[PDB]
């Protein structure tokens, strides 16, 4: 248990337990993992995400 050094913090496991199974929740588990790099930020905003 090195929770502040992992790459998946508490809200990922908080979100996995309460989701449905209609193949959109797997897309949300995917796209919660967009990084928060400045390069990731300019790439995300540069397509109006």
């Amino acid at each position: 248990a090195h929770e502040y050094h992992n790459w998946l913090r508490s809200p990922f496991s908080r979100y996995s337990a309460t989701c449905p199974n209609v193949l959109h929740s797997v897309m949300t588990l995917a796209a919660m993992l967009y990084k928060i790099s400045p390069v990731s930020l300019v790439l995300q905003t540069k397509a109006h995400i």
Binding site: P38, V39, V42, K46
Partner: protein, 98 residues
Amino acid sequence: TQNINTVDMGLGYTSNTCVAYVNRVRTDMGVRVQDLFRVFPMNVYRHDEVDRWIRHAAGVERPQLLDTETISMLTFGSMSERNAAATVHGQKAACELI
């Protein structure tokens, strides 16, 4: 050289101004968000090829050669951006908060 000097002879506040009439604005109610690269010229990313990438995809040109404007900007405080060519609106103004 004259030198007047006044004595206030009022108990409370004996003179009231009121904001009366608006002639015009001087800003533009604009959306030109604040260019933080011209406010903080000291900071870059510590790794190269990601500093030049951010300055490539962030619309701001890189200072190529070392001019005395660059060292008076990094040391002292002066007018970083220049006044543009065409201003039919007026003075520009915005800021940013997360």
